[PDB]
Design a protein around this ligand. Structure first.
Ligand code: CDL
Ligand code: CDL
Ligand code: PEE
Ligand code: PEE
Ligand code: 3PE
Ligand code: ZMP
Lengths: 67, 110, 125, 128, 87, 80, 178, 52, 220, 103
């Protein structure tokens, strides 16, 4: 296709390039949303992080101070 | 591998911009290309999102794991801090490229 | 990253654990009867599976199962989710064991500090 | 006011910041005129030779000949043994030789001492 | 790549820029009008005109040559000679 | 071929940041004579451009719709 | 480039060059067009404020202080046109420029590949050869006895003559040769 | 030669030299391909201090 | 025979093929860039096949096809290491090069030496493949310096540009410092291990020392 | 300030000469006097030569020359997993022991 140059005006665009750009942007966003829906543990994690403060001395094998 | 992909595409997009603006490589003279050049715009946006680690793009599967490994290891504290600041600055310069090349009003010859 | 670094550096490194020297207490100190860890995969099985020396930990059997599942269902690279989750869960349990060891070392060290302070006070008085 | 710019040898002084650029004596103007006249004479000579249609070859440059001669063949006849030249030549020509000799001699003496004491790791060292 | 320039195109573009200059009356502006003798501008105005032409055509005119372009026809001839336009 | 330059009288600084600049300069007591020569850049197809966040969300409208349709189809297939 | 330089720059020339350089660097700082227009109008306001000054010493002092201000406030990375000396596309096509003396060393078969071009080339060569004596005579007649005081060159004073020292200027390689 | 004027019509445009004019003793190292001495926006001492 | 080795060496050889045709009428015509791009695409698919072979069963190999010379107890031979790194990086590099060559067909249309430009791009691709697949230090250094000189030639593409010449020579200078480090590593490895190949280097260096590893770091 | 009359006249004459020179640089309709002396088909001819011949040559070279000396081509031994069947001897590599399964 031949695109005539413009002087001080917006260039002549093509329906094909417009629809291709829109299709690929939509494809990227669909891929992002689809991947986040299925496997969101890649972003938010999969297993909880334990709190060491709640582990009892009995299960950690810590004897009484006096003993 | 991932960087080869998206960095090659980013360089190709910048080259297309340069060729379309008569060998101009200055973002101070670029502008309006978001609607002037649709396909290069979307390609560069996708590449910059992949470069910065969009949560499920090609750069996510390497950069995110790299950052997790750096944070979770017995590393140099200064090296870890500089790596995090470098990630922030990566986002910063990707924004700079997009903002000064595609957004706004034209600054190229008539 | 963590508050442990702040406590050890801007505080009492004597009470905080040493990662390069941990553990500094006998494994039975405070544990009356402690069970040795169980290893499922054998040395010959790991050697045949050609696991990397870093990957030959106590979770090696799940990794071997995952590798076998991936090889068999090769074209369908999305058919090993259960094996992957089993391996990840075993690694998570190993990591929480390491965290428990760290916490045990920390509180044993601070208990030793309290005991020595009490002995010093008794000697002074 | 604004911070001053300090010229260096590898970062010279710009013309617009040169103090002498704003103090122009009437003799400075005639010096500039004489310089322009010299340049114009040389340019006219070169352009005549260059636009000559019957010229085939190279327009010899006496300036280039003088530069190449002074760089190579005019150095020794104008060289005199002075304290500066003697010290600089002695240093730059002898000091590095003794420095490298000492370095290599010390390294090889230590290596040979280790060999004689039999505590140098020479396993698999087959090619020499 | 880009279409070649022509004398008519260069003249039209320079007259376009000059007619978009506010200090110049478009009705009395001809291609032979002098910037200071009959247009009533001055040195800074001429410098800004040369800068506008540089922005228009995407190339720089050195100060040694730009001071002598006192006419739209002179600017057109300079640009055509520099860009190797003969028609 | 033989492109024609659009009429120069259409270029105006009205409805353009250049008229804001002109008003600021008039308050200062000054004027800028090159208003229209830059006013070509603010009119026509360059009149409106998106924001930075809007540029990133270029294809989200169709992407989200396709994602919703695909999720509905997947849910129906899993139920059946 | 096309104009012969003088022995010195006048005060007007210096101030005009400073004006252009300051405007260009301001445009480099003020990327957007409206902002550049605003600040360029302010810069021209400053120049107009100092336009009328009878004291030449004070005018030169103002110029010097303005030069110092420009050097302090210059953009470290000013915009340069691609073809300009600092530009990215500078001297990219110099390897593609080949001269006509190199053109006349071609083989007879190569010359036969272009029969009409070389006839006009021979016409140009005859024109060059038939005018050199007149050009050198004109140059030596109009020069002062002391020598050339400037690099300027005269035009042709006669109806049938050519401007002296014209060949390489006229036959210089095109800006986009290949 | 980098400091030399680029807009002048030198006899040797790339080296920025004229025919017959004296040649600097260190032209071989002051060519545009080699060591540059042109002024910089920031002073040399300031640049050295900042880099170090 | 296993198709793995045959297909990998075939990808490398068909990459090298169009350079042989640089002395032909096709190189003199305007179809040479498309010819090179087509060859690169075919090489990309032919390299995709061994990637499928690896991703199934993890197949890895070393191929010492040609013996070069034996310095007494040290044997240097033309050996290629087709492992995970090679079989993964080759298809990616071929895909990228194919895309770049098409983009250059569009981009460099007005260049009088577009054929030479594509020849240089293909030569760089060949040297990079040599570097990636090299199994011993000497072949790795061959690829090293080959990509270095191809970078030097392609940076200074416009020979009339003084800035381009300066950039090319600057790249050469820094890469030569890196090569100082590389040669240090090669000399240490040969002297202390009687080998330049990865297998024997890995076998003998159970605790690798600072001098060879710092040489490698400096080269990198 | 501006051009002198001599400068303007010389520039006019030089520009006329330069324009005439470029017009002469233009070519003729017959100027390049040269001396006397489907899409899928091209792809098929390219594929047979450029791909088929090298793979033939390289396979012949590897099978009969390279793999005729020892250790020239060394394959990493395939991974053997528990509960497998070694095909060389019909052997059955047994399964692993019962896991201490959790959840
Ligand atoms: C293969 C790889 C490359 C290899 C390397 C190749 C290159 C290196 C090798 C060659 C090195 C240079 C050659 C050796 C020296 C030649 C000197 C010579 O020919 O001089 C004739 C030359 C001509 O004689 P002249 O015309 O009567 O004097 C002209 C002078 O310009 C005017 O003279 P002045 O009156 O101004 O002199 C004042 C002053 C000049 O000297 C100085 O200012 C330097 C002072 C420090 C140098 C001496 C240090 C040691 C002093 C104590 C010595 C104790 C000894 C017991 O004099 C002194 O200091 C007194 C004399 C000192 C003698 C030291 C030796 C005994 O005289 C001089 O150049 C005068 C200085 C001579 C000594 C220079 C320093 C030498 C240092 C040692 C070098 C080994
Ligand atoms: C040997 C070739 C000797 C050529 C002499 C000149 C011939 C001539 O007049 O050509 C004009 C003629 C047509 O051009 P034209 O436009 O009509 O003429 C105008 C200009 O001359 C056109 O000039 P141009 O700018 O087009 O220049 C063409 C070419 C002309 O220059 C060259 O060809 C220079 C080549 C020698 C470089 C010297 C330093 C390195 C020494 C290495 C020695 C290896 C020896 C191997 C056995 C050789 C047996 C003869 O120059 C280049 O391509 C630039 C230099 C590239 C050098 C890259 C070397 C990297 C290391 C390669 C190591 C390979 C072996 C180990 C592999 C281990 C792993 C498997 O072109 C040809 O006939 C093609 C020439 C060769 C193309 C490049 C080949 C480079 C060497 C092979 C690298 C591996 C790629 C696969 C090769 C498969 C076979
Ligand atoms: C191990 C031995 C080597 C150690 C380092 C020695 C440094 C010696 C420097 C080389 C001497 C130069 C001789 C001639 C070189 C070519 C001529 C030249 O000067 O080129 C200048 C050229 C052009 O400059 P531009 O910025 O492009 O400006 C252009 C504007 N139009 O610039 C250059 O290429 C010169 C660069 C030389 C760098 C010198 C210092 C290098 C740094 C070495 C120390 C760092 C070591 C790294 C540690 C690694 C950690 C494991
Ligand atoms: C061309 C197409 C020809 C069409 C028919 C194909 C012929 C196929 C039949 C195979 C040919 C017979 C054959 O290959 O014999 C082996 C024959 C010699 O036997 P060797 O064991 O190697 O003797 C030791 C030499 N010192 O080997 C060969 O000749 C093939 C060599 C080709 C390999 C690639 C050539 C290498 C060129 C690169 C230059 C040197 C690079 C240096 C390598 C550095 C390594 C550290
Ligand atoms: C003047 C003093 C320095 C002299 C050498 C440097 C001269 C200038 C630069 C030359 C660059 C080219 C040559 C580089 C040679 C590097 C040699 C090397 O890395 O040696 C490591 C050295 C010895 O290690 P090694 O004996 O193998 O192991 C036992 C523990 N020492 O191990 C150590 O030394 C321990 C410390 C490790 C860090 C060394 C950093 C070296 C950096 C070299 C490149 C500089 C640029
Ligand atoms: P036209 O031929 O009418 O020109 C009139 C002139 C100016 C020649 C006068 O006739 C004249 O000579 N007047 C007296 C001399 C004179 O005007 N001197 C003053 C010149 S400098 C001046 O005062 C203005 C300087 C202020 C602005 C400085 C710019 C520095 C900032 C730049 C920073 C870089 C990025 C912004």
């Amino acid at each position: 296709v031949h695109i005539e140059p413009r002087y001080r005006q917006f260039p002549q665009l093509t329906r094909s390039q417009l629809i291709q750009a829109e299709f690929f942007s939509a494809t990227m966003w669909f891929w992002i949303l689809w991947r986040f829906w299925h496997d969101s543990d890649a972003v938010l994690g999969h297993f909880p992080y334990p709190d060491p403060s709640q582990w009892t001395d009995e299960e950690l094998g810590i004897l009484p101070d006096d003993e | 591998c991932m960087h080869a992909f998206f960095k090659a595409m980013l360089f190709m997009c910048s080259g297309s911009i340069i060729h379309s603006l008569n060998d101009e490589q200055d973002i101070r003279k670029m502008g309006g290309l978001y609607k002037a050049m649709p396909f290069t715009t979307t390609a560069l946006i996708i590449g910059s999102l992949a470069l910065t680690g969009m949560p499920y793009l090609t750069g996510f599967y390497s950069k995110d794991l790299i950052i997790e490994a750096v944070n979770m290891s017995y590393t140099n504290a200064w090296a870890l801090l500089m790596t995090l600041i470098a990630t922030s600055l990566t986002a910063a310069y990707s924004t700079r490229i997009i903002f000064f090349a595609f957004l706004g009003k034209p600054r190229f010859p008539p | 990253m963590g508050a442990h670094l702040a406590r050890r550096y801007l505080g009492d490194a004597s009470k905080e654990p040493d990662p390069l020297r941990m553990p500094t207490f006998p494994p039975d100190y405070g544990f009356p009867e402690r069970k040795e860890r169980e290893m499922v995969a054998t040395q010959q099985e790991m050697n045949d599976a050609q696991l990397m020396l870093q990957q030959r930990d106590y979770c090696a059997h799940y990794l071997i199962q995952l590798l076998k599942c991936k090889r068999d269902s090769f074209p369908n690279f999305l058919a090993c989710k259960h094996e992957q989750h089993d391996w990840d869960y075993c690694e998570h349990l190993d990591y929480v064991k390491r965290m428990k060891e760290f916490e045990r070392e920390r509180r044993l060290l601070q208990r030793k500090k309290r005991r020595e302070q009490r002995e010093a006070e008794m000697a002074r008085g | 006011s604004f911070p001053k710019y300090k010229p260096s040898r590898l970062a010279t002084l710009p013309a617009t910041l040169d103090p002498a650029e704003y103090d122009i004596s009437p003799e400075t103007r005639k010096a500039q005129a004489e310089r322009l006249a010299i340049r114009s004479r040389l340019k006219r000579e070169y352009l005549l030779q260059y636009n000559d249609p019957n010229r085939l070859g190279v327009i010899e440059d006496p300036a280039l000949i003088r530069w190449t001669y002074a760089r190579s063949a005019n150095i020794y006849p104008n060289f005199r043994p002075t304290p500066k030249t003697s010290l600089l030549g002695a240093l730059f020509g002898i000091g590095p030789l003794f420095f490298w000799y000492y370095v290599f001699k010390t390294d090889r003496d230590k290596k040979e001492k280790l060999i004689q004491e039999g505590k140098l790791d020479q396993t698999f060292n087959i090619s020499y | 790549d880009a279409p070649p320039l022509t004398l008519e195109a260069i003249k039209d573009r320079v007259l376009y820029v000059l007619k978009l200059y506010d200090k110049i009356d478009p009705e009395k502006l001809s291609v032979n009008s002098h910037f200071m003798k009959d247009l009533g501008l001055d040195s800074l105005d001429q410098v800004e005109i040369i800068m506008a032409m540089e922005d228009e055509f995407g190339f720089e005119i050195p100060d040694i040559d730009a001071e002598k372009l006192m006419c739209p026809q002179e600017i057109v001839d300079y640009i055509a000679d520099k860009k190797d336009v003969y028609e | 071929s033989k492109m024609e330059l659009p009429d120069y009288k259409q270029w105006k600084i009205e409805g353009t940041p250049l008229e804001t600049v002109q008003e600021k300069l008039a308050a200062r007591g000054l004027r800028d004579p090159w208003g229209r020569n830059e006013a070509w850049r603010y009119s026509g197809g360059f009149a409106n451009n998106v924001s930075f966040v809007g540029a990133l969300l270029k294809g989200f409208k169709w992407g989200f719709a396709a994602f919703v349709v695909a999720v509905g189809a997947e849910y129906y297939l899993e139920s059946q | 480039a096309f104009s012969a330089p003088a022995a010195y720059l006048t005060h007007q020339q210096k101030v005009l060059r400073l004006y252009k350089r300051a405007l260009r660097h301001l445009e480099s700082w003020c990327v957007h067009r409206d902002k550049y227009r605003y600040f360029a109008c302010l810069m021209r306001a400053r120049f107009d404020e100092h336009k009328n000054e009878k004291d030449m010493v004070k005018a030169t002092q103002l110029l010097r202080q303005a030069e110092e201000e420009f050097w302090y406030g210059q953009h470290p990375q000013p915009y340069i046109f691609p073809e300009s000396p600092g530009g990215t596309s500078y001297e990219r096509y110099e390897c593609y420029k080949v001269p006509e003396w190199c053109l006349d060393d071609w083989h007879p078969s190569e010359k036969a590949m272009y029969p009409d071009y070389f006839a006009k080339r021979e016409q140009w060569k005859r024109l060059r050869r038939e005018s050199w004596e007149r050009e050198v005579k004109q140059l030596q007649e109009e020069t002062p006895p002391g020598g050339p005081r400037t690099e300027a060159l005269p035009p042709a004073r006669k109806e049938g003559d050519l401007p002296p020292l014209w060949w390489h200027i006229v036959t210089r390689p095109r800006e986009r040769p290949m | 030669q980098q400091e030399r004027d680029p807009w002048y019509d030198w006899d040797h445009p790339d080296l920025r030299l004229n025919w017959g004019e004296p040649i600097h003793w260190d032209l071989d190292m002051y060519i545009r391909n080699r060591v540059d001495t042109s002024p910089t926006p920031v002073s040399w001492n300031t640049m050295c201090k900042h880099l170090f | 025979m296993n198709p793995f080795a045959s297909l990998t060496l075939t990808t490398l050889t068909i990459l090298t093929i169009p350079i042989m045709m640089s002395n032909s009428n096709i190189y003199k015509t305007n179809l040479y860039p498309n010819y090179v791009k087509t060859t690169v695409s075919y090489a990309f698919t032919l390299s995709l096949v061994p990637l499928l072979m690896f991703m199934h069963t993890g197949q890895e190999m070393i191929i010492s096809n040609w013996h070069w010379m034996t310095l007494q107890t040290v044997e240097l031979s033309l050996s290629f290491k087709m492992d995970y790194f090679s079989v993964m990086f080759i298809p990616v590099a071929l895909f990228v090069t194919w895309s770049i060559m098409e983009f250059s067909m569009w981009y460099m249309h007005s260049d009088p030496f577009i054929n030479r430009f594509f020849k240089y791009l293909l030569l760089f691709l060949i040297t990079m493949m040599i570097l990636v697949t090299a199994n011993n230090l000497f072949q790795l250094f061959i690829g090293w310096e080959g990509v270095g000189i191809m970078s030097f030639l392609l940076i200074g593409w416009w020979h009339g540009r003084t800035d381009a010449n300066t950039a090319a020579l600057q790249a050469i200078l820094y890469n030569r410092i890196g090569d100082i480090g590389f040669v240090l590593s090669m000399a240490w490895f040969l002297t202390h291990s009687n080998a330049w190949d990865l297998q024997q280097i890995f076998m003998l260096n159970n605790e690798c020392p600072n001098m060879p590893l710092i040489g490698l770091l400096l080269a990198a | 300030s501006g051009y002198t009359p001599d400068e303007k006249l010389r520039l006019q004459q030089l520009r006329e000469l330069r324009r005439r020179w470029l017009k002469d640089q233009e070519l003729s309709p017959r100027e390049p006097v040269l001396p006397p002396r489907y899409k899928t088909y091209r792809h098929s001819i390219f594929a047979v030569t450029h791909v088929l011949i090298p793979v033939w040559i390289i396979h012949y070279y590897l099978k009969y020359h390279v793999t005729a000396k020892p250790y020239t081509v060394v394959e990493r031994k395939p991974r053997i997993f528990p509960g497998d069947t070694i095909l060389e001897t019909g052997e059955v590599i047994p399964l692993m022991k019962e896991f201490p399964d959790q959840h």
